[PDB]
Structure 1
Amino acid sequence: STGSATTTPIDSLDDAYITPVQIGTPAQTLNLDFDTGSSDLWVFSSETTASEVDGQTIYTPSKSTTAKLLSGATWSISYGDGSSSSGDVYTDTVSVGGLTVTGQAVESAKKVSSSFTEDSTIDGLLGLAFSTLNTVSPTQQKTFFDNAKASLDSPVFTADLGYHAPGTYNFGFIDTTAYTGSITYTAVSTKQGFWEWTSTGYAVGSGTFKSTSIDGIADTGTTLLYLPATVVSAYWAQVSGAKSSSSVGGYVFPCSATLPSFTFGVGSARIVIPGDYIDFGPISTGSSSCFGGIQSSAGIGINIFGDVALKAAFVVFNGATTPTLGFASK
């Protein structure tokens, strides 16, 4: 089997992407944030504290003839950015782009933190990291991909995120029309539960390539590109007036700037992030200070190849017995 679904930016900055997901019988369609950095499929629901729902579409398990309470199971997750959610668990039928999993754990939120409430466009998350990170207790549950894998034509999914435009998540096949050149594959460590890999270096604009190993995660659920402070300083030094602002929480730059590109290495191959992808707009409405899309990972504990990086590539998440990651230009 295969599946193919369009993923759409939630706003004009590509702060996140949402993908429609069918849950239950009859189908209830929710728009979920596909997150290769976590492993829980959780949704706003009829059980979510009423004051914490503000415009999201909810899953109502009592209206699904295929929903079953997973008795005794609870979940609770806290993301790196400080947001969180928790609740109980149902199993139900879940379909993405025509690919169907029966008996998928659907984690129903009883509580969500303020940032979730405040974002009316995201109805929940669909985790695509390794199932070892799944938070369901006392019986850990499998991700949608893990459950689908054996049925898929090939045990892979691909992320093709758009810049200020829709893109595609495919399951079970590689669309050879969706990228240019060849796909370069690189090793993955699953030791921390992430799609963790090592970039071979970087360049800033038309500058020379610096060969250096950068360990990090391929994380569709993180907006920005977070790299070591040395790398980030080298990038922003090429933008007149750019500076790190403790009050704003990262590098800012004059909105009048033209940003240089940033290149990262994948083996001997190179992925070029155009400068415009690195612009996240005014820090507050009407400001002429703009927020940068490349930020320091110092104090995160890991480097993160988030959407800014991934949207410059066609990315293969290869879930073979020994997982790997593939990157192509597009």
Structure 2
Amino acid sequence: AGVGTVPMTDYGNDIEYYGQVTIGTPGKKFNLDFDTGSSDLWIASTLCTNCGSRQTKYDPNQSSTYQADGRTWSISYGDGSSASGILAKDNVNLGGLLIKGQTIELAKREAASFASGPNDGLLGLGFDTITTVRGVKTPMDNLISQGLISRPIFGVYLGKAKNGGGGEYIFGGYDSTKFKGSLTTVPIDNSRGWWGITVDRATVGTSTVASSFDGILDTGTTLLILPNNIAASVARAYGASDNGDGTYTISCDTSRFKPLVFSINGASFQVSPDSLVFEEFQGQCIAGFGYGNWDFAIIGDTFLKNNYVVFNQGVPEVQIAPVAE
């Protein structure tokens, strides 16, 4: 693979994708979740007392470049999952790019959801303003300052499970074989530490199910989470019923459904009919969209697996285009 290219592995039904990263000297390989919704880099360590037995754990004793740090960390995510531990410093190899002296966060405790998960930790790709510890430079920050990438960008391709899954992140560049047509530039609002964009409107067929609303591009989230009114308006278009827990039950037969189209900065981007179904359990299908108590939308995987995105932390901005297939 090229310099800065990190092949991804699709877990389950497009639930989440993870890439391998090498940490320490000589170093171990860890499967990390690439999350644009957060900005901390944490991993399971041999100091953890409730971590999954299947997770690969970082061992300070086995790295000659390990450097102790007297600070502790604690993080709580939206989905209720959590973890805490101590800070440390060591080298991180990202797709051949060797970040020296990256601040890493070793877990001493983690929620059961992580212990049972397929990954060994998270690689946060959000902005520096939301790192849990003040003064910590994110991996992207260091790739830039150490001259490991000439442009402050990363191209993201998330494959659909029905197409062999897969995925690919490219730091410092992007891959045009993954998308069709021209890229559309969309300004980013990073005031809250996330990759926030404005969606002009959403339509299903000839019906405008939503006018302009704000959202954030979150690879760390599976579903397309919309504000209450917007979700209800969308659900009515597909005749889906509210499950009461923030999800919808939708017909498993999407052959008759029309795509959910997002108008962003003048161009059209969609969530194909097949992406409208997230999971099928015993003949029952859960919709690819849900709802929460937020004034903004959380644009997760469902959308990203349909559109290639080039994240530019420098401007900041993003470039989007329909995936090729």
Could you state the TM-score of these two structures normalised by the residue count of structure 1?
0.91
SS of residue paired to 2:211: strand
Could you state the TM-score of these two structures normalised by the residue count of structure 2?
0.92
Please tell me the residue identity of whatever aligns with 1:154. Answer: R
Residues 233-289 of structure 1 show CA distances to partners (whole Å, capped at 9, x for unaligned) of 23322334x20011x54211233454432111221111121111121223xx52x32
User: Residues of 2 paired with 1:128 and 1:114: CA distance?
Assistant: 23
C-alpha displacement at 1:2, in angstroms? 4.7
- Aligned counterparts, 1:86-97, within 5 A: 86-97=84-95
- 2:5 aligned with 1:7: no
User: Which of 289, 299, 323 is matched with 2:284 structurally?
Assistant: 289
- Tell me the residue number matched to 1:111: 109
SS of residue paired to 1:220: coil
Aligned 8 A contact 1:262 1:273 in 2: yes
- 2:297 aligned with 1:300: no
User: Which of 158, 161, 179 is matched with 1:161 structurally?
Assistant: 158
User: Residues of 2 paired with 1:319 and 1:271: CA distance?
Assistant: 22
Please tell me the residue identity of whatever aligns with 1:108. Answer: L
Please tell me the residue identity of whatever aligns with 2:52. Answer: V
- Tell me the residue number matched to 1:325: 318
How many positions carry a matched residue from both structures? 316
Identity of aligned residues (%): 38
User: Residues of 1 paired with 2:210 and 2:296: CA distance?
Assistant: 19
User: Residues of 1 paired with 2:180 and 2:188: CA distance?
Assistant: 23
Q: C-alpha root-mean-square deviation of aligned residues, in Å?
A: 1.8
Aligned 8 A contact 2:247 2:289 in 1: no
- Aligned counterparts, 1:117-266, within 5 A: 117-119=115-117, 121-136=118-133, 139-150=134-145, 151=147, 152-164=149-161, 165-204=165-204, 206-208=205-207, 212-240=211-239, 242-246=240-244, 248-256=245-253, 258=255, 259-266=257-264
User: Residues of 2 paired with 1:290 and 1:97: CA distance?
Assistant: 37
User: Residues of 1 paired with 2:3 and 2:190: CA distance?
Assistant: 24
Aligned 8 A contact 2:254 2:274 in 1: no
User: Residues of 2 paired with 1:21 and 1:174: CA distance?
Assistant: 19
User: Residues of 1 paired with 2:237 and 2:110: CA distance?
Assistant: 40
User: Residues of 1 paired with 2:316 and 2:125: CA distance?
Assistant: 13
Which consecutive unaligned segments of at least 5 residues does structure 1 have?
A: none
Please tell me the residue identity of whatever aligns with 1:266. Answer: I
Please tell me the residue identity of whatever aligns with 1:187. Answer: P
C-alpha displacement at 1:30, in angstroms? 0.4
- Aligned counterparts, 1:20-99, within 5 A: 20-49=20-49, 51-70=50-69, 72-99=70-97
